[PDB]
């Protein structure tokens, strides 16, 4: 019941319906960097799986469990709450692994596992790492992890960097200005211009971009999944101090993430950086309401505060100022209403 | 309420959140054929509004009410269940129409209107006309219509026609065939190929197409909103008999719709046909899992059956056979998971 | 006889009937690259024929014997099992070479030659080099070759490369899909979908293609006809490891071949590569039933295994996997039912 | 058996291998005029099948049996000699007709049926109706037909007509003239020109043509399958007297056929005429060695003689003369080596 107490029923319904589609599973599977890196992380750390007990949190089609099986896992508990659980069972039988993979339909916060596991595996990451709040389910499942146990992924580093994108900033007002007309089919729309601007600026922009728009080395916030607690992700305060590498108008912050699989043999990384090939996580950009001018050598400092909501998302609050000028800007954004951009 | 008894709370939440965004209101407004045709229908039938009482069902930003006001409506009750009701009120004040347009926040099945109206106006059409099930709310609102009152739109014609599009058919099978692989990173996926094909073929394809793909004259199913009852739309049985004009593989049925605004002065049509400019309704195609071969001269007969569900959509059953050969295809589709091409 | 023990009578009948037609000999002679390269190989190595004894295995119309004669061969035994041996005799008379070219009707495994030869010549190559299994007759005929004799051709290189061709893959699955129909004139065909797909994908595709579809440098398997024995061609195991140069779906393997005529004066090559002008051998592609995704830098390894059958062809088994993912495709192929796509 | 005594094993092997492929079955099935007319003939004559015993000779995939089942047949014995019999069995199970369709693997001349049948159905027609000689198997199967029994098809009409096609005639010599060259890579080929011409002229041309090339109303030779005996098709003598409608050079005879399904309710026709849509039987044209000039009003008379051979085909002998001139021509053709021109 930890899941249903932090999540509106209306949101859980839609969430699980979405991951219940094969088309969606196929998308995730066809991302070769994602699928291949998970496989590489598990198989190259075979000693972390050989004759071990394994929990796969939100197994979907089962693919990560099959990898754990390839690596030599004695026993794998594959938990999945969507109707995809049925399809995972089918694959476990057709691949003759009924003696090693047990699919358990339900939420990991609600099901009973019969024993403690040596290692947990999952793909719980959303946009800017935290969105969809499955990282809480992943951490929750540590109640089943032996003390010496491991987690794959082991850590997550959400990166934050300032960007310049005059054209993105301008789009907002250009769109909002639809309403700034005194006779649209004889109707004066202009009283709504302000509300339109607000709405557009509350949407985090999900797409990719040229790394040339980044104005400073990114700042890293690390969650270590071995030590973290579920509750650590209810309120996430990310302080930042950027040392500006380029002079210009900073229109917002860009977000991406890495996770690392820290095994006994080696550490394997999965990156969603804009310097790396595009994943189904893209990148995320949050605009400031007002651009901040900064010179190369200036510091831009502030806080990104993420406050978990009952729609399995975050309210994002960003405050920033150029320390050498005192010019400051903010923005409050809702990751439950992202703008998926094609410009 | 009738609305909450026919609708899961989870679906209503999302539905009304979607229409609550200004960005979404702007997209509907910027469809010039939609906005312009509604305006033309109302203003050219000014006598249907001059000094009349009006109900606007699901008014959104209020745009249709403003049109009713331009046409000379004494009084317009604008009902809207999303938070857009707040923004509509703002526009009514800034346009100095507080004496003529009264916004009433809530569902039309739940609110109290103080009087009966002469005419109802709404844009309740979804994909394939019926999707989103607002046509029920529109019909429900007739409890407020005087005897001899009018409705704008007045009727809706659904059009059904068989199409050939080998490339469309192949896309879906090409996607589905992912699940045939016997060793995807060493994993045999092929036990799910059937489930994958079923799911993909249950998705109605929302996009446009050249009219050259149509293999017979369309068949028309008319709902007359003046006479129809809310419950008529719970189960909709559309029989069809196409006379094939071209020989080839029929890969599915294509759907579009017209509505007509039948006023005292003139009848104005809003069409979503593929012969007409593209609207935000596009057209919808339902693929058969297996094509049917037909020769020109052959008849293709069957039934399209639409059964309303609690997610404000329809489960669609399409059964079709080429009479001269007995070649038959049955197909089940869910308009709650459309494929946008 | 070695021939009739490795070949069903039904297959030999048809094989020899096919090469017995003048129309078929004209088609082979009109391939100028084939005819011209054979001529160039023989004439430019004239010292390999001047005053030498020659065996032409499966001479057909006789054309290669005439070339050996132009080069100065003392004596040429031209063996041919089809009825074309009589048309070859006619040409030997009309060209006043009765003193130098002796046609011997019959199979080279069955006839008696009166002496040993200095050199053997033949065109025994089929699709993918080996099809029709005449390479065995060519190797069998070495019982007539002196120690230190030569073979023309001398070696054969089979080239294997991975290819991407989505449109090819689609045409065959579109054909196969006929058998998914639940109501073809009211009859449910779909229980045979699996079998139809198998059948279609077992057909090697004989045509040409742009070299741009190739996703890695080809791999070479060499048969040296001087050293090889007839029995070596009963089971042919071709290992391969491709280093992928491009990322994408690998829909199969493409095959072609070169033979080299290694004479005393020079080596002349006859290539059927897609970089070279088209011959009557074209190229051959074997499709995988399921494509393999590979990234550039990945290795694609496996085996092409050819097992000779009694219908003068091979049962081909192709096993390939992307080493970095363990994605694997196994495919069977029957060279006796090729799909001609040109 | 009657089949193996009239057929060389080499030929039977290949024949049955060819019809054993699903790809080939699919081709036959996708010809809508063939498949649809068979269906229409059986269902419109439902009273010929309701609660009746049925034999389907060479059922292939089974499609005609399924039609007999749709029409209400109590029991259908579906005989098929190719490995397609296996696939037909699979379809009978997947269509829940194991109680009504019994697939019997083997040749209809060799298998045991447990009872006599009311009606036989088959698609035994080849090029010019008779080619491949399955019409003999169809007639052979009458040993299983009750006295009142019927046959579908019931009759076959072969149509013969004189044609003009200067360009077709010319092609032959243009091809043959490959050999009429004194130095093809230094070899004199010309001694073979005669033999090449002969070979080309012995090939019946399988393709279609504009009906405007026909110079007289066609002449009809009818086989009634109810009365005919297997041996009647060993030697088929077709006399003809054409009354010329157009003046010009007659370069040969064009052949096509109709079969009729004569039921109790109605007669349904399947035509392969050039006036009708193209089928997988096309039409067949046999050239004269020398064109015959005829004026409109002249009569062109002669005989077409078909003599069955052991390669499941016919040797065709055509003799024709213009009666008013005494200008005569001849031609011996072999339908076992047809030229596909389409
Ligand atoms: C109007 O649209 C929007 O505005 C909108 C907004 C958005 O944010 C959007 C985000 C999108 N997502 C997206 O791109 N993802 C990337 C894919 C990788 C993540 N894969 C993953 N996390 N798999 C988890 C598996 O774990 C299961 N699971 C979870 N919790 C569990 C629990 N407690 N117990 C048991 N099993 C559990 C779950 O069922 C599933 O199988 C896509 C569309 C969007 C549209
Ligand atoms: C992943 O993507 C999917 O899965 C998906 C699936 C889909 O099906 C999608 C469908 C889409 N539809 C769409 O673009 N339509 C445009 C047609 C024009 C507007 N049509 C209409 N009816 N206006 C309603 C107005 O009337 C109000 N209203 C309704 N009911 C009321 C009641 N009872 N009382 C009072 N007011 C009420 C309502 O709030 C609003 O103002 C778009 C996206 C999709 C995505
Ligand atoms: C749908 O169609 C199919 O299914 C199919 C299947 C296929 O595989 C096909 C293959 C095709 N091949 C083809 O175009 N090749 C041309 C390349 C030239 C190779 N030259 C060659 N082989 N000539 C040997 C000569 O040497 C004689 N000879 C052989 N053995 C002998 C022996 N032991 N003793 C004495 N004489 C012997 C022989 O008679 C002949 O004169 C064409 C069509 C196809 C269609
Ligand atoms: C070397 O290339 C050439 O030069 C060549 C020369 C040619 O002449 C060619 C002719 C071609 N033919 C062709 O296009 N036909 C189209 C019409 C098909 C008619 N349908 C049919 N005949 N069905 C027979 C069914 O009846 C079964 N069956 C027969 N006898 C049986 C028996 N005794 N017992 C039991 N079952 C028996 C049989 O297995 C099958 O299922 C094609 C290629 C050619 C190439």
Numbering used by the authors:
A (entry chain C): 136 to 478
B (entry chain D): 136 to 476
C (entry chain B), D (entry chain A): 136 to 477
Article, verbatim:
Protein arginine methyltransferases (PRMTs) are important therapeutic targets, playing a crucial role in the regulation of many cellular processes and being linked to many diseases. Then, another series of compounds (12a–12h) were designed and synthesized, introducing also an adenosine moiety and exploring the distance between the three groups. We also report crystal structures with various PRMTs supporting the observed specificity and selectivity. On the contrary, we were able to cocrystallize the compounds in the complex with both PRMT4 and PRMT6.
All six cocrystallized compounds (12a–12c and 12f–12h) adopt an overall similar conformation in the complex with PRMT4, revealing two common anchoring platforms, the methyl 4-hydroxy-2-naphthoate and the adenosine moieties, each one occupying the same binding site on PRMT4 regardless of the different linker lengths. On the contrary, distinctive conformations are observed for the linker in each compound (see below for details). On the other hand, the methyl 4-hydroxy-2-naphthoate moiety partially occupies the peptide substrate binding site on PRMT4 and mainly interacts with Y262, P473, F475, and Y477 on one side and F153 on the other side. Surrounded by such a “frozen” binding site, the linker of each compound adopts a unique and distinctive conformation stabilized by interactions with the protein platform in a region mapped on one side by catalytic residues M260, E258, H415, and W416 and on the other side by F153, Y154, and E267. Regarding the linker between the naphthylurea moiety and the guanidine group, a length increase from three carbon atoms (n = 1, 12a) to four or five (n = 2, 12b, and n = 3, 12c, respectively) brings additional van der Waals interaction with W416 and Y262, thus substantiating an increase in affinity and a corresponding decrease in IC50 values. If the linker is shorter (as in the case of compounds 12a–12c), the two guanidine-stabilizing hydrogen bonds established with the PRMT4 main chain are lost, and this may account for a weaker affinity compared to derivatives 12f–12h. In fact, longer compounds 12f–12h showed IC50 values in the low nM ranges compared to the μM range observed for shorter compounds 12a–12c.
